[PDB]
Amino acid sequence: ISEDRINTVRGPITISEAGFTLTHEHICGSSAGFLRAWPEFFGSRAALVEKAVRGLRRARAAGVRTIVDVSTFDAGRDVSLLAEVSRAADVHIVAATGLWEDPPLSMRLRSVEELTQFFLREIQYGIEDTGIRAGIIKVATQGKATPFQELVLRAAARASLATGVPVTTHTFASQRDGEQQAAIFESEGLSPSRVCIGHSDDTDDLSYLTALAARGYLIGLDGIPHSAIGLEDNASASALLGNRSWQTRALLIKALIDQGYMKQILVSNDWLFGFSSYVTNIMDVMDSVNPDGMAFIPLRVIPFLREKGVPQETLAGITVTNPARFLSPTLRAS
Amino acid sequence: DRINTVRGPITISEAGFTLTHEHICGSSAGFLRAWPEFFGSRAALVEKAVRGLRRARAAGVRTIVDVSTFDAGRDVSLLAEVSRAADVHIVAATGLWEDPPLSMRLRSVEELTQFFLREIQYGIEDTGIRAGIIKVATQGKATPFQELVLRAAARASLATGVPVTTHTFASQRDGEQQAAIFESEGLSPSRVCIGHSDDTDDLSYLTALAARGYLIGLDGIPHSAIGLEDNASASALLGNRSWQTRALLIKALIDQGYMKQILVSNDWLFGFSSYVTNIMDVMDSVNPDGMAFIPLRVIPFLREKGVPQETLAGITVTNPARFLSPT
Ligand SMILES: C[C@H](CCC(=O)O)C(=O)O
Ligand SMILES: C[C@H](CCC(=O)O)C(=O)O
Ligand SMILES: [Zn+2]
Ligand SMILES: [Zn+2]
Ligand SMILES: [Zn+2]
Ligand SMILES: [Zn+2]
């Protein structure tokens, strides 16, 4: 019959309003303060807003209703930008706290207790002076965790336990980062069902993925359209996007389904509409690869899996119900 | 004719007593806006900075140069608020310091030049406040990116006439490599201040640079961990040389004929998030005078050593005016 609230950049929404949800996206992958200090890098702020609003309208027309922007502070998350484009496009956006790959000195020097207070601040009080409350915590490793990355993982688990909001991660999938991340989260008493091990489609190792899924972890197959096939002459695009086909990444979805782990899958594009933390031309290159942007999951991956025999009701469970269970906050500890 | 401040243009004569290397708040890009509770509160930091700038003004300071860059967390709206409430001019900086984010580290020399020019000619962020100085940094031998920054800083200075000021590892003689790269871009040494030079006692390093026309920034005079020997983190940052030892370098350079190329400052700050958590309280406990330390302590110390008042006015008033006035 019933087919609690999630915080978005426009306020609370019910779990039913979330609908088709892309769990790992970015409006703009940047650096803290950068969009405000140098909007001309993106053409203009107004150009970036219009480009993002068109992109979100394209995804909405394909059925997307919510995206989770997993841009942290140090990824240059600007929640006022997310709020504006969410209003104009009528697509819900969940904002993130946490820390990504590029913390500044003022973060890198902090204690696990201090990082915990920062993450709690952005969840419980709001981000900057906007009142917008984060609905997920993003963390990152790139191989074995640095000492600071450990602190971030522990502060994230402690913030998650105190607030009920879930944790999503960036991995070097080929290095099986998810195993160490899981070990640290579990040492903090975090439930695996509140953790998504992200960028897991970057690897073909199914024994690694199914082992985490069997432990209750969510498996983020979140970069399906990332591929430099056809751009072999472009070293920067090839290093970023990899030489594995979108079809190859997509078949991991079906492989997890066939092995019984449908309930552990999350799917996304890991797209963006501006991109300043890499080489200068990279957004233009990615847009030439995938004009559909965030609409790639519903317009290309769903019809692909449907013809391989995956039932629509299974795909709806992965893209609607699974994110809903992920993002719905659990009870606060104590 | 005019110098750009966070309140707008001023004439050269309005600058008066000027501290050439200071910080309202040493932080990181976006950090003050995202986590102001680190400093108690934004209002508390404002209040602390206004009280400190008002004391410096009562001691005779009329202008400070805030050499906080984008990546040092410069918030020009904070600078504008505290300058207005303390009636002390503040000159804002562009350039890049020792903590550039990916979106900066990945940029070309041409792109960096455009960014520095924007903050000088157009304004910082959406405030309309234009930078009046370019800040650069090395910590020993320059990284490849730091070489780009020095070159972009030189090109921006040439296009606008605003001067360049540097962070050095003085005991590795960084000013020499900085001078080499600047001169390879055609930049005039008289447009360059080699900063943190009071961090070394090697006077021959300093005088060779000055004999080439450079300005020498003796800018951390009150930095000292004397009495804090059981504090490893303060000792590493502040050093174990006394403020008297740093101040004697001012007299030494005067005695060697370089009084017209000395720039003096405190390198102080009212908030400090880019180091260990307690560091601002520790620094305040050893120098409560803050930015008023130069006029309240260093001026009387030098006058007792026999430096005449006209020499001290030339260093604190005439030199900064000549340096900041765009060419
Ligand atoms: C598009 C994505 C944004 C950053 C991230 O997901 O780590 C990428 O660069 O891989
Ligand atoms: C006090 C000074 C502020 C930053 C700078 O001058 O490099 C420091 O942290 O060394
Ligand atoms: Zn990532
Ligand atoms: Zn991402
Ligand atoms: Zn410095
Ligand atoms: Zn400084």
Numbering used by the authors:
A (entry chain B): 26 to 28, 35 to 365
B (entry chain A): 35 to 361
Copied sentences from the primary study:
Accordingly, it has been characterized from a number of bacterial sources, including Brevundimonas diminuta (Bd; formerly Pseudomonas diminuta), Flavobacterium spp. and Agrobacterium radiobacter. The present study focuses on Bd_PTE, a dimeric metallohydrolase that has a (β/α)8 TIM-barrel fold with two Zn2+ ions embedded in the active site. The buried α-Zn2+ ion is ligated to the protein via direct interactions with His55, His57 and Asp301, and the exposed β-Zn2+ ion interacts with His201 and His230.
Interestingly, the crystal structure of A53_2 has a monomer in the asymmetric unit and the dimer is formed through a crystallographic twofold axis in space group P43212, as observed in the structures of several other PTEs: A53_5, C23_2, C23_3, C23_4, C23_5, C23M_1 and C23M_2. However, A53_3 and A53_4 crystallize in space group P21 with a dimer in the asymmetric unit. This suggests that the crystallization reagent PAA initially binds to the active site of PTE in solution. Subsequently, the octapeptide spacer 26ISEFITNS33 penetrates the active site during crystal formation in space group P21. Since no electron density for the co-crystallized OP ligands was observed in any PTE variants crystallized from PAA, the latter may have a higher affinity for the Zn2+ ions than the OPs.
